Design a protein around this ligand. Sequence first.
Ligand SMILES: Cc1ccccc1O
Lengths: 391, 391, 391, 375
Amino acid sequence: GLVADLLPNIRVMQGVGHFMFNYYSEGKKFPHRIYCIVTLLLLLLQYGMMAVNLMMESDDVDDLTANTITMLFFLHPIVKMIYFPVRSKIFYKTLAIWNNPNSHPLFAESNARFHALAITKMRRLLFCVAGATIFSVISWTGITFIEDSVKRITIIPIPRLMIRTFYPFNAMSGAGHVFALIYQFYYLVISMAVSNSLDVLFCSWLLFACEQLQHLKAIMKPLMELSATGLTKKQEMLVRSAIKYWVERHKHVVRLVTAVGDAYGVALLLHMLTTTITLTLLAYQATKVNGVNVYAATVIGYLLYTLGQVFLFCIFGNRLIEESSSVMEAAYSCHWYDGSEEAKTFVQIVCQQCQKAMSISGAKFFTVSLDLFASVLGAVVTYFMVLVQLK
Amino acid sequence: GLVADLLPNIRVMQGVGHFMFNYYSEGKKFPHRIYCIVTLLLLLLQYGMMAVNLMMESDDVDDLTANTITMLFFLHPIVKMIYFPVRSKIFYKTLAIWNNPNSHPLFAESNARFHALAITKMRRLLFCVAGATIFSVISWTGITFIEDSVKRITIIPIPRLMIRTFYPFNAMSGAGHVFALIYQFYYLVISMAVSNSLDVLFCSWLLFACEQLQHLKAIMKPLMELSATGLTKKQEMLVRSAIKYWVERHKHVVRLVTAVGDAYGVALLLHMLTTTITLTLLAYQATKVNGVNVYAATVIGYLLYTLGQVFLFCIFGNRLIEESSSVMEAAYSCHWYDGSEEAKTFVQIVCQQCQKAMSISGAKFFTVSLDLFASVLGAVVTYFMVLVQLK
Amino acid sequence: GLVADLLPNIRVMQGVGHFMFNYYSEGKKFPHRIYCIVTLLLLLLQYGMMAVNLMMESDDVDDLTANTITMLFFLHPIVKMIYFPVRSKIFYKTLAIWNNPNSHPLFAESNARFHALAITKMRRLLFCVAGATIFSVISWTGITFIEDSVKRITIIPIPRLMIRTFYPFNAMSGAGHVFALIYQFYYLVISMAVSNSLDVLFCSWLLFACEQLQHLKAIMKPLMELSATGLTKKQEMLVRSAIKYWVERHKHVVRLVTAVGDAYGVALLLHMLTTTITLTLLAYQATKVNGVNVYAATVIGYLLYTLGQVFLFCIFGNRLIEESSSVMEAAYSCHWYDGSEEAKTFVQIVCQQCQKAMSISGAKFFTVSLDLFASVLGAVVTYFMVLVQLK
Amino acid sequence: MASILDCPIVSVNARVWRFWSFVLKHDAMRYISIIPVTVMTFFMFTDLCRSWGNIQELIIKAYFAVLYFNAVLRTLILVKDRKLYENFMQGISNVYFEISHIDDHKIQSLLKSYTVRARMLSISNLALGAIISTCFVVYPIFTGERGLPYGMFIPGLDSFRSPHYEIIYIVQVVLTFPGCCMYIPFTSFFASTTLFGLVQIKTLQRQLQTFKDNINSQDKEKVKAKVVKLIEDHKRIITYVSELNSLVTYICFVEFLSFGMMLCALLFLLNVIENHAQIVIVAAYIFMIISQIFAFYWHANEVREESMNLAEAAYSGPWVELDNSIKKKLLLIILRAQQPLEITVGNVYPMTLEMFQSLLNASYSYFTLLRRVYN
Ligand SMILES: Cc1ccccc1O
């Protein structure tokens, strides 16, 4: 079912160490556990070293703010990869939702067409997010290498590393520098991979829901045409079967949406809290930006990544909302007047249900939508404005 | 009726100093009333001392705002204990609303199951809030005893007491110290108990309403299934009776919600006014925090208690709202297409009515929901950020 | 169709600076193409000269802010003129939408009356906006001529030019001075023409939609009267055709609204972004105002122009929203109880459809309405408050 | 024939407006009340413009000038649109008589309760206006200096020298008597009108829940007629609310702006004065302002909530046993009723208590701005 469609996403998140010991033979079940534990340990060790570094650099506020922004950035994937294992039951329940779908002979072709379209859109989203993460890692490494690693207190050389960190080694000579560079590349890659892979899984769920809704409207039209004449008993049972198919598939979509909503609603609650703190610190940092030096590039990259994650969630939530509202519109937009009273009643009840659009909530404290992205962006820009005015 | 279910809460209120002279034998009606009076006196009496303290602490804004925060927190319970006697008639009207429920032979088992579930959840909530109150009292005692009693103007010793109040006695040597400690412990316990008990009664009303709504949906399913199995006279009468039961029970739930809304909406208006002022003062205090000293613990405890009350209220209001919306959704999710004109019309009217979600308002100035808690939290956070940056 | 009604606006766009190689003979395709290229080249040339002028005047903040405000205001038309050509297909699809409308032998008179009213209001709006732009350009020229071209650094004679610009010519003697004067007059005229012409095209689309909605209501009343008696088969066909006409025309209006939102949905986004920036800078400039004849006049004129553009968009968005709501209201407020069953179900479905008002959104980030204008005004006044307080 | 003066709800405002010949009669009193006060407000604004020097006089003037400008604006709208107000009040009287003729205990009790509430609100508003006008006149006495009840400057005219001062004072006093009047009743009228709205709304609710009482169930003709009547009453309520909405809508846009400025002014004034008892007078000013604001917004909000409760009461009826058609009609009634019968501010924003809180917050923000600049 839905496990097959999202198989590339499942496998990519499994390969980076995102647990999910559910979709392969028992043989691979054992080594994957050790792999995931090792990835967890490495990520946590690097984070702890970063925390030690923050504790050492608490004498000033600029370094403290930069460190705190880095820690929130690298807290996102830790929180995500600790959140999935505890809630793995809900995730597996969601992924197995569409194992047994609806079926009517007349509406099979549209079902297949929109299923294929959903699969293609999911693949496109996965590839785009993977490319974005790869670009982020490469840009981070490049900015690390062009930038002149040094500290101003007098000027003191600093080890040239992508993430400021405290290391028991020299971290500045050949062996230590090489090991630190490789380890930090691995860190960056795995952190971005885990976070963006879980996010893309959520967005792929939403994409499948939206495409199923589009199929529902596209068959809404010929269904109502089916009911039109008056009708012999056989055509009457045909209309009954078509209405049954439509209603059952709509309820299936609602079930999928509710499951996704609860699970990644808790997920987004945590995500957006962390994002709010990070964006406050980033507004303060941007207040310090002058010229087109490397500092500006780093600040702009941090802001771009944070707002990009928020925008991904918001755009797919908006897609779901607009798809439900358009289900209402397409329920109205057919030739019900020529139909029968049963079909007309079915149309009225569908419109009643579609009055309110499906949405995903962050633990009921908000709804993910381009309105939420607009609100966060407005808050960021306003806070930056008052910060510059104060300075 | 609903007084048997709410009996432990009523008994806690009666024994802790509320004017609930309705639900026992006429004998202890006499002493209890007298007892109640004394509690009031004592509360207000201690308040007197606190008040006069504020008068001489009006030298610097620091102790002035600390005293103001204490005064508002301890104003809460006095306002609630004086509010209940004034509005006792409506409270008793609400408590007696559910004395004569409807009944249908087929939906009796579900009614019993969901009534039991409601009672269990009410007891769970009561125990949780009692535990939270006891935890707060013991935390106050511990914070008082671990911290060092001293006032800086030069350092001058001050009596080691839970809260800064004026006592005509020495209040520093043994006898005055013990008397003051006992009085303060009694004051704390009684105030928190009365306030949280009234809040828990409100939330228990909301829980009962939500569970009745859940019962309504759970029977909405087999109701439509009954209608589907076109219909003979006996079947038509049975479907008519089932629809009657459903509609009458829904109207009963609406009645309960309206009564609760009136009473505790006036209550919530006053509550949120007080909490807004308290949160402003607490944000100002939080801007003064440095380190992880005891002062930070006191400020965090004040914030946690205030936001916990606001939360509890918003949690249960949002539960009611989402339960009504879910009543709409579950009205959609039955096999109405296979039903009858009467049952389909019943579903249509139920959905149209559920297009508006039951909610509790604070005297129409707002609606209690998780959105309200989010707004309060955001307001306090933004005010704190503005104050800290402006400094 | 809709092109015939809007021909004056289409020609105002076409002949001034606005491409649109679609609605004239092949002979004018090539000369008009070259003319558009020349207009774009001249506008971009003057824009670049303004930018380079801003570059040297970056030492101070007052001159930098004034230059930035001018740069953004003249950014608006450049964005508009390079935005229409890329989206030419969607704009041409918005037009030619009403080429084949519905028709009934009974509702033709109201259709003609409301079509005439829509055309009259379109011409009224076009003339009003043209007069506003002419007033703006003449006011600009007057204020430049009465203004003293003196720069304080020491007092230096600035060239008495209408828009600050760095010109390779002398720009002081007769030749360069007059060349620049006529060039800048042409720049202002063309920029305002292009911007306000596309804005008025959007508003004219909205006016057409609103007038069609009014026609739908005005025939909804006699439509229900027609349905009301018990109807012979011929009357059944007549009422069926009336329902079909009403539903088809409402769907056509919905199609027009969606097409207008698609064509002009992201021009609003860019316009509001550029506005926001301009309003911020103008709030600072007003904070610099001290009741001077020219400075205050210039700031007030800039604010008036920006708020007038936003106000026009919001006015017509609110018109569409209120028109849809009024569609629901006028669907209810008629004699739908005596109408046949089909007419009653038609009213039910129309009322369900009209629950939500048609709206135009800035790419789903916001909706153009008088609420948006109120929010913009509140934001600008609040930022002015902050600027004055933080002095 | 029901008359405007016959209906208790609108009797007080109708009498007050007819005394000045605003809405019921035309005579010299209309102009004698309008023109002198308009001239007073104009010279008040001129003095405000000329008083940029010191902030205290500026603020007190500005407050009085805005108050009197709003009063004159309300009066000009009232006289300009006298016919529509007369028609609205005549319809109110007719509907009041119709409702009073009903034979339902609860409907009659609701009628009397709301009628007494409206009358008490009107008389209380008039009394508060009288007292606050008295405070207006006595305000310049506590300061000690040769002040005026309201600032006013005539081009090249000395007001603090020669006996001329006194005359101004005296005439100003009489100018107060129309002023307060011209302001108060409309507010009350709005309240009163809105209250009747609620009455009407609530009446239908009862008739929605008891329409089947004493009506034979077997015959559908009478049930159909009764539901048709319920629909007609709902449409009548909608029309009433829409008309009141337009009138008070334009008035309330101007009122929102003026009230924001006035509350700012009063809050700033209360925090600067240092006289013995003038602070109590400023506090009375604030009480008056917020009382009017609360009356407006609270009554509009109740109109909305009672329309939604009209929807709810449409649901809670004897609709289970009715034929299919009547159930469809009640479904349509529930559909329409769920939209609040909003009374909008300038037709842009529905009038609710949310806008009341927003107005208070904006006034406090203006007050903080004035505090910062003045310091
Ligand atoms: C001008 C005025 C208005 C309202 C109340 C009293 C008063 O003197």
